[PDB]
């Protein structure tokens, strides 16, 4: 299968440089060009540039001065680098491949890399149980969750029971607290009869801080 | 560069209905237009290339038409999994440019929220902060009010709400209201109540606990 996997999300200090690695499979960098597109609140989808099969590069006009794209064919890697980032360069960055070698119809995308441009510090979250009780159990259904609190920057990924539990899961959008740190909750509803037999674990991962926490959530 | 104007900004339709998206270009671009779908937390997915040409693996209900400046992406019978934003892209003129997107919301029948309340964990209390969480689960439509009360005092300005995007299966929203207090303030009070108002409830529903039991 054709795939593009990007390096993890993170913080970059203002006026510093951004580096992303795109690793491809299911095709050869010698046969296809790889494009870079970003997506931001202020400017939406922007095409940034491309490295072609034979190594030539094109950069979108406002980016020629601060953008470099390189690759290693043998290692199937494409290297994106942008200089002197400012706040409004905060965006999701994607690598992408077209349907045909010369074209721009983007049929294959990387998973995106959230880049936050900020002077602040990376901080991992604390994870707190949102325990089920009778004040969270009606008609045989119990609600339980995890409070993922005080991290920076976005994103944090949350899953349940190592991926095995997805049905009835809601992971809320993060909210910025006055502290300038993010917080969110992830909940799930389950049969209350299962609280005595099944274990419920939220798996939390904050890649920018390399913080991985598994929080067991039990009825209190 | 070519300016692509997408209209309208939001579309709201019922399942089973046809729906069309408009993409207008600032000068003629032949048929050099591609369309993409973006779902919650996703990367764009290519739907249609060159105005009308199909893409492998894309359901037949998606099609596109148009030439010159006026272009249309259509879905002949909308399903809940179609909840997403939709973008056009032109590539008749370097550099390739995208429109600002159209949002697709789905209508459905009114659904009352299930309300759950969670006291702060003793774990969190060790850090000197207390979060009290109120969950409004699987409701429609999106409008809801959450009122917090501590010992019958109205809480104002010390809570934050987050709301999910529409669920791709049942079209409902869920909402979390988090009330945040210092450990000191939390220990000085007893009754914590979350009151929920919604179109699907004949009366406001209140969930509460006493600190302890």
């Amino acid at each position: 299968q054709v795939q593009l996997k990007q390096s993890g999300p993170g913080l970059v200090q203002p006026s510093q440089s951004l580096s992303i690695t795109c690793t491809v499979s299911g095709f050869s960098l010698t046969n296809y060009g790889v494009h870079w597109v970003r997506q931001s609140p202020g400017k939406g989808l922007e095409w940034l540039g491309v490295i072609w099969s034979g190594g030539n590069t094109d950069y979108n006009t406002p980016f020629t001065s601060r953008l470099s794209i390189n690759k290693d064919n043998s290692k199937s890697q494409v290297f994106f680098k942008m200089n002197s980032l400012q706040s409004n360069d905060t965006a999701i960055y994607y690598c992408a491949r077209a349907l045909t070698y010369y074209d721009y119809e983007f049929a294959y995308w990387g998973q995106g890399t959230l880049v936050t441009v900020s002077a602040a510090s990376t901080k991992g979250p604390s994870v707190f149980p949102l325990a089920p009780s009778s004040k969270s159990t009606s008609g045989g259904t119990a609600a339980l969750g995890c409070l993922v609190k005080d991290y920076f920057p976005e994103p944090v990924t949350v899953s349940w029971n190592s991926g095995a539990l997805t049905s009835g899961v809601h992971t809320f959008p993060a909210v910025l607290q006055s502290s300038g740190l993010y917080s969110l909750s992830s909940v799930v509803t389950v049969p209350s009869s299962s609280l005595g037999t099944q274990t419920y674990i939220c798996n939390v991962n904050h890649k920018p801080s390399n913080t991985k926490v598994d929080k067991r959530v039990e009825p209190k | 560069d070519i300016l692509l104007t997408q209209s309208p900004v939001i579309l709201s339709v019922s399942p089973g209905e046809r729906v069309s998206f408009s993409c207008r270009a600032s000068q003629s671009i032949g048929t050099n237009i591609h369309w993409y779908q973006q779902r919650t937390n996703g990367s764009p997915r290519l739907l249609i290339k060159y105005a009308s040409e199909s893409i492998s693996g894309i359901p037949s209900r998606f099609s596109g038409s148009g030439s010159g400046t006026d272009f249309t992406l259509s879905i002949n019978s909308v399903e809940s999994e179609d909840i997403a934003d939709y973008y056009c892209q032109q590539n008749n003129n370097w550099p390739t440019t995208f429109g600002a997107g159209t949002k697709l919301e789905l209508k459905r029948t009114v659904a009352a929220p299930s309300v759950f309340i969670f006291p702060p964990s003793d774990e969190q209390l060790k850090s000197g902060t207390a979060s009290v969480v109120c969950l409004l689960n699987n409701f429609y439509p999106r409008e809801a009010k959450v009122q917090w009360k501590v010992d019958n005092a109205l809480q104002s300005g010390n809570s934050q709400e987050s709301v999910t995007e529409q669920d791709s299966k049942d079209s409902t929203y869920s909402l979390s209201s988090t009330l945040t207090l210092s450990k000191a303030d939390y220990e000085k009070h007893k009754v914590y109540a979350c009151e929920v108002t919604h179109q699907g409830l004949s009366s406001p529903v209140t969930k509460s606990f006493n600190r302890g039991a």
Binding site: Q39, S40 | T40
Partner: peptide, 12 residues
């Protein structure tokens, strides 16, 4: 509407 980095969705 504006694109939201948290949800990758348009927020209006």
């Amino acid at each position: 509407c504006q694109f939201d980095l948290s949800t990758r969705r348009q927020k209006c």
